[PDB]
Amino acid sequence: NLYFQGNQQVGDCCIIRVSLDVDNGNMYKSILVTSQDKAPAVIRKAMDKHNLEEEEPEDYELLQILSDDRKLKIPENANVFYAMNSTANYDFVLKKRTFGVKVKH
Amino acid sequence: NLYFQGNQQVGDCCIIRVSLDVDNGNMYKSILVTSQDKAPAVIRKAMDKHNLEEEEPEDYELLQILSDDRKLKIPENANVFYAMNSTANYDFVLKKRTFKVK
Fold first, then answer.
1. Which strands make up the sheet holding A91-96, listed edge to edge?
2. Helix (H) or strand (E) run with residue A21 in it
């Protein structure tokens, strides 16, 4: 079996696939998303599976892969189970943000 | 001596310091900027010194560090010697660029 983690005793949930660009490609790990889960709880689970223990969830974002050219950003503190496109591919990318500095463009 | 590279035979230049976030910190390397160098040529020199040979200059950008909370983005194909703030610190950061997100 695959091992998963969740902070819910009972109810609806889904298994998604979370990608990370590593070793000149993309490694996908399966992640449990409970109906109550917001983006940071899902990011921590994905980081644990991708062995990013010394890193922080605040430095990453979750984007649902709609197609090869389209991505859907999951807001920083949105409920994943409802913000995601439930009829589209349950494939996501864990992306490091490019961030308290004023940048003159 | 420090070693540098440049595609100019004669004329004015400046030595800038280019930072890369690596090994829980920021390593700075000194980079030669000739009066004729545009951002891609400077980025390639910074990448060589920071050992990013397997990476591409199109994936990075230069930002001049004006202060701890102020930065000046050098446009992708701007002449660095002229786009930079000439009176500010010649300290820069080599940063991975941010890229159809709905």
1. A26-34, A13-21, A91-96, A60-65, A71-73
2. strand A13-21
Q: Would you identify the CATH topology of the domain A1-105?
A: Ubiquitin-like (UB roll) (3.10.20)
Residues of A whose CB is below 8 A from B73 = 103-105
| H-helix or E-strand spanning residue A64 | strand A60-65
- Tell me the C-alpha distance between A99 and B3, whole Å: 32
Burial of A30 (0-12, 13-18, 19+ CB in 10 A): middle
Q: May I ask the CATH architecture of the domain B1-102?
A: Roll (3.10)
Cβ distance of B71 and A104 shorter than 8 Å = yes
Query: Hey, are the CB atoms on A73 and B98 less than 8 Å from each other?
Result: no
**Which residue in A54, A53, A65, A80 sits closest to A28, CA to CA?**
A65
Phi, psi of B26 (to 5 degrees): -130, 115
Distance from CA of A102 to the nearest CA of B (A): 5
